[PDB]
Amino acid sequence: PLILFNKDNNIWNSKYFRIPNIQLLNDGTILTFSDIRYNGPDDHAYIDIASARSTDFGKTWSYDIAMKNNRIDSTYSRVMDSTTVITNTGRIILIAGSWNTNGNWAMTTSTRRSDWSVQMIYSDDNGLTWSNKIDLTKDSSKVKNQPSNTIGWLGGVGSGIVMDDGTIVMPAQISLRENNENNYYSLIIYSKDNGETWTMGNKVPNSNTSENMVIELDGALIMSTRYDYSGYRAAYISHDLGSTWEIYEPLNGKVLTGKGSGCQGSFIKATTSNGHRIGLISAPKNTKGEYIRDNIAVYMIDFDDLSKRVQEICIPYPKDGNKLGGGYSCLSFKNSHLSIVYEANGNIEYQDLTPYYSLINKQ
């Protein structure tokens, strides 16, 4: 597989890369992102977000820093954990978490984390240039319905979606002060004005849920989320754009994730030529357990043939993850093409999976 971001040969002399992201553009351009983890694998470190862009279907790549941290702390300033979407205008939005101090974003403080913010950039030239950073949390003018007991929140790490009428929906994760503890939950945020302003949904039914993505299905939102220490990815459905949730049985509990903590993965919808809507999920099998996160696999469900069990399509990364930080992945599906980016021993690798989609599509 192509090494897209190479810890042993990159223009930033970065020691590590983590948290990859991919969008297949309507015109065939491939846009990807990654944390530039300059000094090593740690989350609590100095990080910027790179882009890598290809106009020859992944043969060659042009690299850039898509978003810089706040440059306040040479050890801890970081923007990281990209969540992206392409809107119906073709605008590309990236939302990242921003901090500049040591300590887990959700658990370190009992009040709103003072160095925390959510930063947005967008591109109206298909990822060639980016806006200035837009701070979504410094005031109350950009995001509605943020809870007063928020410790912090960020995107779900992956891709958002667009509803039938153009509404943008982004997966998110939040930490909330509740009865003298901090509990973290998945949720969504949505924008009806091309990302200028947002409204936050309500938390899903279970805590210990974090990184996630949602698909749209007949107006409903279906979320596949990391559910820590359950052994599986939870799934929930919302019929009111994320105000209420219930368990979605056909996917809940069906993708197992091994012993220990959960892991980020991706979840997207494709419509095959027979009209069926299928869900594709990427995540480590983690048969070896905890943070080994071996065998990043791709799974399929057919929402129009739900008695057929979830199927393992392929394993793009049939290797142990690096315990320092590995296992994350991102699928993108567009115009009958399917691509993946994933963590691979401190690098990011890229693969075109379109031949597997052809097998599924049965033309």
Side-chain angles (χ1 to χ4, degrees), residues 3 32 74 95 120 166 199 212 269 325 349:
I3 299 169
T32 63
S74 52
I95 287 166
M120 194 177 72
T199 298
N212 71 99
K269 181 183 55 172
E349 288 180 4

Side-chain angles (χ1 to χ4, degrees), residues 28 85 103 107 174 198 240 268 283 307 319 351:
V85 68
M107 297 331 279
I174 186 153
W198 301 82
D240 54 16
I268 60 166
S307 68
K319 306 183 184 168
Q351 281 181 52

Side-chain angles (χ1 to χ4, degrees), residues 143 145-180 182-185:
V143 186
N145 192 44
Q146 179 169 299
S148 64
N149 59 326
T150 294
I151 303 298
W153 64 266
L154 66 141
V157 189
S159 184
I161 56 176
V162 180
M163 311 285 299
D164 193 46
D165 68 11
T167 293
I168 301 154
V169 179
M170 278 314 238
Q173 47 183 321
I174 186 153
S175 182
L176 294 169
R177 187 65 175 182
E178 307 175 324
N179 286 319
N180 279 27
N182 291 7
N183 298 304
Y184 57 95
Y185 302 83

Side-chain angles (χ1 to χ4, degrees), residues 98-137 139-143 145-180 182-222:
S98 176
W99 303 264
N100 63 252
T101 62
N102 197 14
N104 178 269
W105 71 271
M107 297 331 279
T108 298
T109 60
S110 56
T111 66
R112 168 177 171 161
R113 176 69 164 268
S114 73
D115 54 314
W116 157 74
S117 67
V118 177
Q119 302 286 332
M120 194 177 72
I121 50 168
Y122 67 93
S123 170
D124 278 329
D125 56 7
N126 296 315
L128 289 171
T129 66
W130 297 94
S131 69
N132 293 320
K133 292 160 60 182
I134 297 150
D135 189 323
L136 301 181
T137 55
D139 56 44
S140 62
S141 81
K142 300 289 167 139
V143 186
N145 192 44
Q146 179 169 299
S148 64
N149 59 326
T150 294
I151 303 298
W153 64 266
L154 66 141
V157 189
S159 184
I161 56 176
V162 180
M163 311 285 299
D164 193 46
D165 68 11
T167 293
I168 301 154
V169 179
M170 278 314 238
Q173 47 183 321
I174 186 153
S175 182
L176 294 169
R177 187 65 175 182
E178 307 175 324
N179 286 319
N180 279 27
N182 291 7
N183 298 304
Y184 57 95
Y185 302 83
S186 304
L187 74 183
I188 64 87
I189 65 171
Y190 66 86
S191 178
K192 303 211 198 177
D193 57 6
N194 215 25
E196 201 182 343
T197 65
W198 301 82
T199 298
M200 183 167 340
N202 298 318
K203 61 187 175 147
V204 296
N206 300 278
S207 67
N208 266 28
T209 53
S210 57
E211 295 145 345
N212 71 99
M213 290 160 65
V214 296
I215 65 158
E216 187 267 355
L217 192 63
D218 303 322
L221 293 178
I222 295 176

Side-chain angles (χ1 to χ4, degrees), residues 268-305:
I268 60 166
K269 181 183 55 172
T271 304
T272 45
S273 299
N274 60 7
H276 291 201
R277 285 79 50 82
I278 67 162
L280 298 165
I281 292 173
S282 67
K285 296 178 79 163
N286 197 26
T287 67
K288 299 190 178 170
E290 292 179 339
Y291 295 106
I292 293 165
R293 291 159 170 183
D294 52 286
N295 289 290
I296 301 176
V298 173
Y299 305 99
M300 199 267 291
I301 189 169
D302 184 350
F303 297 110
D304 298 299
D305 190 14

